[PDB]
Each structure stands twice: as C-alpha cells, then as structure tokens.
Amino acid sequence: TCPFYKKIPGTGFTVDAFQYGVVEGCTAYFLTHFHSDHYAGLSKHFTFPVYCSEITGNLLKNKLHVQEQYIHPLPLDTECIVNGVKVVLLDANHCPGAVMILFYLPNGTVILHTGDFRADPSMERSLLADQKVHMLYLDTTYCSPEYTFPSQQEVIRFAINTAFEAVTLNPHALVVCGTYSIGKEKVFLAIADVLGSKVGMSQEKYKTLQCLNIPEINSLITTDMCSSLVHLLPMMQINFKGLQSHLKKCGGKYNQILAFRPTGWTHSNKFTRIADVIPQTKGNISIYGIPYSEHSSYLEMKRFVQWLKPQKIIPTVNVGTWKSRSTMEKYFREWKLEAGY
Ligand code: NI
C-alpha cells in the first residue's frame, strides 16, 4: 500500500507510485523520472493515464512498452490543466527527462514536489519566483553537513584532463566508463569528445540513449566497438577481473585500460580534494572513482529551501528510521530560525 508522502491531498493524483497496484481514487499517476526505484511497477499491461516529460515518455514507450494511449507527455515551463487542476513541470537538474511538479490545488494551496533534484541558483529564476509554496515534498538524499562534493563542471574537467593525458602518453590505451541507469552521460560524452572518438556500447544501451533528445547524438555514439576507443560497460564489470576480461576481447588493439566509476558521495570526500584523487591500479589497469552527483549537496539544498521559504517540508528520502527523521527535522528548524520565515 501507497505511503502518505506519495499522495497529493485534495486531488486524484499520486507521484512515483506504480508498485502498489491500483491506488484507491487515483485518476492520474505522475512519474518524475526514469529511475527504477521510482517507475517500479509499469509495463505494457498498465491501463491508467501517466503524466511525465517527453523524454520519460520516450523511455516508457520504447524500454517498458507502455502503450501510447496511456502516455501523456507535457512540455516544461508551461501551465497545463490535468483533470481540472493547474500543473507545471520544471527541470530538476537530475538525469535526462527528470522534473519537479508544481500543483495549484483547488482550495488555493500550492505544492512543489522536487522528485529527485540537484538544487541550483538558476531555479530561483524559473516560474517559482512568482509565488508561495505551502508544502515542499523534498529530495533529502544528502540532508547532513558532512555531505560535500565538487561541482559537476570540476569533476568533468578532472576526467577530461586525466583521459587526454593518458592517451597522449600512450596511444594504445583504451578508456572504459561504467553505467547502470540513465544520468551522468556528460562523463563519457566529454571524454569521447576530447579524444576525437565516438562512444562504443551494447545495443541495449544504445537504444536507451536514442530516447534522450540529445542534440547530434548520431554523431556521438555507436554499436561498433572496434571503431571506438571509449567503451561503456555495466557498472558491475568495473573491477580488475571484468576489465581484464574485456581487454582480451579487443583483438590486441590495446595494451592498457583507464576506467572511470562514477559514484555519488563516498567517505573519501571527507578528506581528498578532487585535484588530489588517485586511482586503484593492478598491472596495466587503473580505476578512478569520481564523485559526479545528480543530487543536491547539503549546502545547495539549504540554499534552495531558505530561498523558497515553504510553510511545511515533507521529506521523500531517508524516511525509514527515527534517527534519520529527527536529524532532518532539526536542520529544517535551524534553516527557518536562521532565515526568519
Ligand atoms: Ni533518481
């Protein structure tokens, strides 16, 4: 059964609620983004209306085979009426297609659901500038001050410079990048662009990327592994065994691998600056863990919420323990006493 923090009071709507069967009184199911924890339950057998972005809609149709008649894509930044209620979708700065949803309730209340997001100062000049929010349903993934990490731009600068140096020193090195879901595509796209290569991958992954409305994509990716010196592999293969195994398949073209494992936050962020990051190495294989996050840092979250000044906050992540819930409520009260709302 569907938890409270996935329901929108005074509407027939739910958000990211597909794993509970038929939800009593739900006339429209919203999907914030195409990540498995959030879509859990959708398939070709689904027969209720799904509201989402264009990109999420392309993924539902081609990857999960949801029938076209039940897919309702909405443009961003545009007032839309759904089942008699005004809604707006806003870019969440998470993975491709990910949105926040603004709901203008019939009684005058205004609710923002962030989905998953990476807060940014640019969001302070969206359609949120105008107005009051009475309830914030907040992505609290990294809601504690210990969670620090660099900007995406600094992390990509590090990856580009590391890959370009290694291949210029050795033209016979291969570069490998781990993936398991959508999101973080700048990591392998930026590396391939500096090396003058297309990105090689399986047919399954190529199909997923073809759904994402990325400009000039046909010029950037391929299923012909032999033509490419940047390869994508499932994330589970990014280890010395899996990489040795991969180098055997490449027909003596290559004598070295440099691999990247994008992660979220790890505890080595508590000590090591991005500049100072070093790899794990065995023989002719080196593996870099790089902290490329698509969720808000503590400081980014705090800034956004202090700007928005919501009357009530409902967390949607880390809700399962008394200690987590208590910790988050403590920080929401500090932020409010500090800023005066
Ligand atoms: Ni997500």
**3-state SS string for 72-87:** EECCCCCCEEECCEEE
How far is it, in rounded angstroms, from Cα 268 to Cα 291?
Answer: 10
Alpha carbon of 200 to ligand 1 centroid (Å): 25
* Cα of 212 from ligand 1 centre, angstroms: 15
- CA–CA separation, 254 and 171 (whole Å): 9
**Experimental structure resolution, Å:** 1.4
Tell me how far the alpha carbon of residue 285 lies from the centroid of ligand 1, in angstroms: 30
Determine the Cα–Cα distance for residues 179 and 185; give it in Å rounded to an integer. Answer: 9
Q: How far is the CA of 172 from the centre of ligand 1 (A)?
A: 36
The CA 29 to ligand 1 mean position distance, Å, reads: 17
Report how far ligand 1's centroid is from the alpha carbon of 35 (Å). Answer: 5
Give the span between the Cα atoms of 16 and 6, in whole angstroms. Answer: 7
In DSSP notation, 279-296 reads -EEETTEEEEEEE--SS-
Experimental method: X-ray
Instruction: State in Å, rounded, how far the first CA of the chain is from the last one.
Output: 35
Q: How far is the CA of 280 from the centre of ligand 1 (A)?
A: 28
As a whole number of angstroms, the distance between CA 233 and CA 261 comes to 10
Q: How far apart are alpha carbons 318 and 93 in whole angstroms? A: 20
List the chain domain ranges: 1-147+296-341, 148-295
What residues are neighbours of ligand 1 (ion), with CB under 5 Å?
A: 35, 116
Query: Please, after which residues is the chain broken with C–N above 2.5 Å?
Result: none
* Class of the CATH domain delimited by 1-147+296-341: alpha beta
Ligand 1 centre distance from Cα of residue 116 (Å) = 5
CA 217 to ligand 1 centroid distance, Å: 23
H helices present in the chain, as ranges: 36-39, 54-64, 152-169, 185-195, 203-210, 240-248, 298-308, 322-339
CA torsion through residues 295, 300, 302, 304, sign:
negative
Query: What DSSP state is assigned to residue 166?
Result: H
Do 295 and 117 meet the contact criterion of CB atoms below 8 Å apart?
Answer: yes
Has domain 148-295 been given CATH number 3.30.2230.10? no
Query: Cβ(178)–Cβ(261) under 8 Å?
Result: yes
Residue with the two structure tokens 């508590």: 270
Q: Are strands 50-52 and 28-30 parallel, antiparallel or unpaired?
A: parallel
Distance from residue 33's CA to the centre of ligand 1 (Å): 7
The whole-angstrom distance between residue 246's C-alpha and the CA centroid of its chain comes to 27
User: Which positions ≥6 away from 271 have C-beta within 8 Å?
Assistant: none
Instruction: Give distance in angstroms: CA of 169 to centre of ligand 1.
Output: 37
CB neighbour list of residue 199: distance below 8 Å, 6 or more residues apart:
177, 188, 189, 192, 220, 221, 222, 228, 230, 231, 232
d(CA 208, CA 212): 7
For residue 236, count other CB atoms closer than 10 A to its CB: 9
